[PDB]
Every structure is written in structure tokens, then in C-alpha cells.
Amino acid sequence: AGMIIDADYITEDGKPIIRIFKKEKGEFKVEYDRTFRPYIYALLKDDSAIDEVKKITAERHGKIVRITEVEKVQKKFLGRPIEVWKLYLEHPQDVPAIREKIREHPAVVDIFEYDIPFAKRYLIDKGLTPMEGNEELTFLAVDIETLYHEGEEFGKGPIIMISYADEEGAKVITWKSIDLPYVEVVSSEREMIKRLVKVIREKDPDVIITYNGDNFAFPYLLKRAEKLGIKLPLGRDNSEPKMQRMGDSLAVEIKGRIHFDLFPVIRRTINLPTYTLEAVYEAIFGKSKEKVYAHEIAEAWETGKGLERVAKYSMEDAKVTFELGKEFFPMEAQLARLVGQPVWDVSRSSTGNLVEWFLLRKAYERNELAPNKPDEREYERRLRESYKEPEKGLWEGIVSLDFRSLYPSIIITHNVSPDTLNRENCKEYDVAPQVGHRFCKDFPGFIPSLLGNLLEERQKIKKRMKESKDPVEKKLLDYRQRAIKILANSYYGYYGYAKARWYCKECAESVTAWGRQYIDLVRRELESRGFKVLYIDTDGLYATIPGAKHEEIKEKALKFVEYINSKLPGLLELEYEGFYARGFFVTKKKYALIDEEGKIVTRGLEIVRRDWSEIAKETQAKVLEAILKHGNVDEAVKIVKEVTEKLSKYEIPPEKLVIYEQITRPLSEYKAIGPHVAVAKRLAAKGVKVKPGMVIGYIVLRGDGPISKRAIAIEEFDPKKHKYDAEYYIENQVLPAVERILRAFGYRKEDLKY
DNA sequence: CGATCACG
DNA sequence: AAGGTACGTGATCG
Ligand SMILES: [Mg+2]
Ligand SMILES: [Mg+2]
Secondary structure (H helix, E strand, O other): OOEEEEEEEEEEOOEEEEEEEEEEOOEEEEEEEOOOOOEEEEEEOOHHHHHHHOOOEEEEOOEEEEEEEEEEEEEEEOOEEEEEEEEEEOOOOHHHHHHHHHHHOOOEEEEEOOOOOHHHHHHHHOOOOOOOOOOOOOEEEEEEEEOOOOOOOOOOOOEEEEEEEEOOEEEEEEOOOOOOOOEEEOOOHHHHHHHHHHHHHHHOOOEEEEOOOOOOHHHHHHHHHHHOOOOOOOOOOOOOOEEEEEOOEEEEEOOOOEEEEHHHHHHHHOOOOOOOHHHHHHHHHOOOOOOOOHHHHHHHHHHOOOHHHHHHHHHHHHHHHHHHHHHHHHHHHHHHHHHOOOHHHHOOOOHHHHHHHHHHHHHHHOOEOOOOOOOHHHHHHHHHOOOOOOOOOOEEEEEEEEOHHHHHHHHHHOOOOOOOEOOOOOOOEEEOOOOOOEEEOOOOOHHHHHHHHHHHHHHHHHHHHHOOOOHHHHHHHHHHHHHHHHHHOOHHHHHOOOOOOOOOHHHHHHHHHHHHHHHHHHHHHHHOOOOEEEEEEOOEEEEEOOOOOHHHHHHHHHHHHHHHHHHOOOOOOOEEEEEEEEEEEEEOOEEEEEOOOOOEEEEOOOOOOOOOOHHHHHHHHHHHHHHHOOOOHHHHHHHHHHHHHHHHOOOOOHHHHOEEEEOOOOHHHOOOOOHHHHHHHHHHHOOOOOOOOOEEEEEEEOOOOOHHHHEEEHHHOOOOOOOEOHHHHHHHHHHHHHHHHHHOOOOOHHHHOO
């Protein structure tokens, strides 16, 4: 009746209850369902076996687990009818307890759909789609500033400012006197945290926007709330924000709301060497943002001087986080709806996992038994499966062309699907060029069928946009057709994704083989037009007209795409991505370009990370600037020769030689003792409370042996007594950072010293 | 070398 | 207050 924003489950008297969080004509509504039961499927060697199989037992929470009910069902598997048994369980946590007991059984051929989280199982099976309708959501951006000193335990320093922003403006809560109109002064860290809780409960936002709140703002708020003995009842059910382990990093959920962390979103959507809020804001809104570094914040807080500067930075962090959230949420909301899963989960997923959620829902709709995810063995074998070289030098006036909108059409016309591949007793088939894979034409494949529907749906949205005089629906429909384009263009890549259920190596190669015929046509037609192709990948190409005027290159390129699209049948489409003033290419997905506005765009080259020393990062940025901004590779080579000589002669300040690496576990848990851990053990031995989250700063000293034995804690480094390892900083830091870039110009590691 | 570890 | 724990690249260890 309203708009679904999330779904989860609660346990009551040992039984699961599904919770559906809704927004209905401006109001928060929570619907409960007690009737949905967890299940798996089992393919048996013979029907007789069910009598033995239904009697399988497990143990969970001290008590035994049973198969509640069994049901024989007819489904489709590998494009063939299949008879399997639906095995019902009492609680979803029963599934991981009993699934291997069922799989182990001598009469069970295989088990299926045994790793689908219960709340997602519910949404699929009940045919429920989140984010449908015109329902208007409310938003709040939240940020925090902490007092930090070098290499402190996560949460030792207090939170000193909390900022938030809305359409009503950006505000700061602090516990020191600062005279600014947007600053609220409270008495303590405890009262500042309680004020944020009060702001969230009163504003009752549907969406809480953060910039990396999954790993910084919420874990820190929770750590300080713990130390202070106070609760954070931010959930609409008064629950505290909940930390979820996603990879090695975290994910924070706020119940009844959408915690929208922009950090994974922006990282997926745009290409930047660093994802600082300042770099991101400038990239999206073309406006500069000032950074106030942690050491400046500590100095201002401790001295009590220059606090206005810190409060302005805190306020801007919230204000720009609000603006970025409003910019990036509409597309995440349309992707959620398209795949039929909540924004929380979708905003945190790869495109491959978006495809899998879309396929799982469509598989239920079409009574198609879903394949299983590969085991560790199969996953590694897929990674091991096997399926031009760029022009050297510095090129000017580079035009970029995108091929990606070609592949969905190839999958559909050739019926490329795992269920149509090398079918026995097939009457008509398509044979892939060179590779020779045969795709049955007798029935539309599961994937080609879905893709066709997706593409038809996009054409209908586009037709509705041309015929619409309402700018509000035109905006919404624009996000919708874009969301379809993103999902449709992810299928080619998905066929080759090693963790995919509907993984198909032969599908991916066949699509590559058929796609190549069009790529060779584009290449030939460009070359006859005077263009030189500098780089080609399955995704696109880069070309120039050697020694031509920039507007002439653009005009001819724009005319070229207009022409090719008129020659290519159907929905096969070439796209002019952009233009670059300069660029160079090293190998596949290793290149660097500069646009006409001076913005450097690189792929697979930059080392902007804390585990690389400043000297290596500084040298790399300088080499890229000499090449792209100055068009001078000889300047770049001289930069490297000068830096290495300076390292040899001990002319580089020790602060530019520090390496930072986080401690992620108790020190005794390490299998390999890397330099940061060798340093950490020595600190612990000295009485330092070494805990996970600590970031270890070290300098590699001159000497015999591996680097771990020669690493020193930065706080212990004495320039008089210690001598850094110049050979380590030259060969393991500086030269690796620049050798890949310079290789594009004919230099070897050996050519970059005197 | 393969295993282990960390970055964003 | 559930809920399977990404992914891909590169460096140093053992
Ligand atoms: Mg959830
Ligand atoms: Mg901040």
C-alpha cells in the first residue's frame, strides 16, 4: 500500500517474524509476517529416499533442529524440467545447521537455494519490491570530528564536534566555547553525543547520510558511547546502530531507517586517485573545499585558539555530505527498485551482485531452480581459466569511445546463456566465431529473455520521456532508464564473474568473439577517417588524428559516432565518452589522461595510500604532472634521478619516509610478521596497549636481513643515531611508483638513476 | 615460489 | 535485536 524501505526478521518464542519497514503517505509503518517459512531444495536419486532424508536432524542453540515439512515440486534447471523436494525449516538459523547434513546423505544428489538471507528470501518469494511509488523520504547528513594524536588506539581520543545538515541548514555541536551562529555549545562529550541522539529522534529522518560512517563516524560514536556508559537509541525501535562485518571493513545499519554511506557509492560511480570528501565534492559540483588536517584540529582544540576554523570545516563536512547524498541517492533508489532489494544492501553491492539479486528474483518468478555459488575449489579454477598492445609515447587530443552498449544486444540476438550452450538434440544453433560455442535457438535462454525485457522496458521509458510535458516525471524516468542501462551493461561482465551462480566462461568468450567483429569495423572505419587508435579494450577505445586541431578531432569524432550508430542494426550503440588534452597508455587498464580543464584521470597506476611513503607518492605525482601538465617526459626522468640521488646522500627528510600500516588483530594471531608487526611487538613489550585499529608508523633502517628486522617506530627514530635504508627507498618505494609510467616512453628501471 | 596481509 | 562476512592488486614473509 506504501513504499518498502527495508526488511528484516526478529525471533519471538524461538520463531521468526518478518518485519517490513514502510513509508505510507508520510508516515512510518511496520508490518509483521509470522507465516513465512525458511526452506532449501534437495535433488534425490529416487523418490523413495525422502523417507530417510525427511528424518535428518541437526543441533542449534543446545536444541535439535528438524525438517518441518517436505514438498515434491516441479521446476526448471539448466533449461530442463526437474523434480526436487522443498525441505521446510522452523528458523532461518536452522538452514546452516542442517544443510551439510542433508548434502552429506548418500541419496541426495545436490542441495539448492541454501544461502539466501531470510529477509531477501521473503522479498523475492512474496513478490515485494522496495522503493516503489512517489513517497517522499526525509534526509539528514551526520559527521563527527575527533581529537587524534599519532598512533593512538581507536577511540582513545574524545569526539570534539558532531555536525549535521538538512534543508534547514548545517549545524555543529561542540563542548568548548566557539562563537558562531551554527555552533551549539554543550558541557561535555557525553552531552554532545546525547544532543545528536535528540536531533535524530526529533527530525526522525528516513535516511541518514554519512561519508564513511560505516567505518569511522558510527563505530567511533559507539566506542565513545560505551566508554561514557550511554546508549545511542537511533533505531526507530530504539535500537543502537549495528555493526556488520563486510569483508575486513564494517557496515552499519540503523533499524527502521536507511543508513546511506556515500563512500562505497561514490567509489563505484566515479574514478578518482583519492576519495577525500574535498576531491569528491569538487569532482561533482566543480567547487573547491578546504581541508583541516587532524594535527591542526588537535592543536586548535588543545590551545583553544583557531577553533572557528575547525567548526567551519565540521559544518562544511555535513553540508557537503547532505548535498552529495541528495545527488547520489536517486540512482541508488532506482537500482534498489530494479533489483528488488533494499537501498542499504544495494548501495553496498558490486554490479555483479546486483545482477545476481535480479536473477534470483526472476528465477523465482519463472519457476527456475537457481544454481549454487561455487565452492572454494570451483571459485579458484574459474579464476585460473584462460579466455592489442597500446601505442607508446605521449599523445595529444585524445577522443574516448565506449563499446559497452553493444554486448546486451549480442547476448539477445545470439541467445547466449548457460542453459542454451551445447544442448543435445538441438535443431537450430548459433556458433560463436573462432571459439565455436553452439547456442541453441529452440527456446529463448533465461538471461537473453530477461535482457530483452530490460531493453524493451528502457525504450518504453525513453518514449514516455519524449511525449512528457511534466519535468518532475521526466527526471524520475531519466533515473529509471539509466538504472536499466547500468544493469544491462553488467551482464557481459557477470558471465565471467568467478563467484556468479549463472557463471558461464563459454558465454563470455562467445560474446567477446561476436563483439570483436563490430570492434574491428569501428577500428577500420576510424582508421580510414584519419584517426589513429592508441588503445582498445572490450570496453572502448582511445584515438586521435595525429597533428590535428582539437575542435577538428572532436567534430570528426562526434560525426563518426552519429554515422556508425546509423549503420549498426537495432540497439547496438557506440558512445562518445569524452575528450582529453593529453594521455599515455602503459598496458590494458593502465593509462593516464588529462582533460582540457586540467583534471588528471588515471587507471591502474596511482599509489595514493598510507602504506606508501610520501617520497614515493610525491615523486609519482610530480612525474605525472611533468608528463601530463608540462608534456615533458625528460623533466619526469630528471625528477626521478634527482630524488634517488637525494635519498643516496641522506638529503630527504625522515617524515617523508614513514610507512603506515594498521594492526588488524591481537599480535599473537599473526602468521607472517611484517615490518609493522615486528615494530608493534616491540611497542607492546615496552608497555604500549597494542589493539586492532592501531596504525603503525615506521622507517626502514640500513642493514642486513629482511626489512622487518630493520624497521623502527617513528617515535624512536633519532636522525643523529639512525640511518634510513636509501636502497630500500630507491628500489622498493620510489622506482616501483614510477617505473610502470616511464616504461610507456622506453625507459627501464636502470635508466632512472645517474 | 605460495601464503599472508593490507589498502581503499 | 540476524547474518552472510566484497573484491582485486601488490608487497613481503616463510
Ligand atoms: Mg538488512
Ligand atoms: Mg569530517
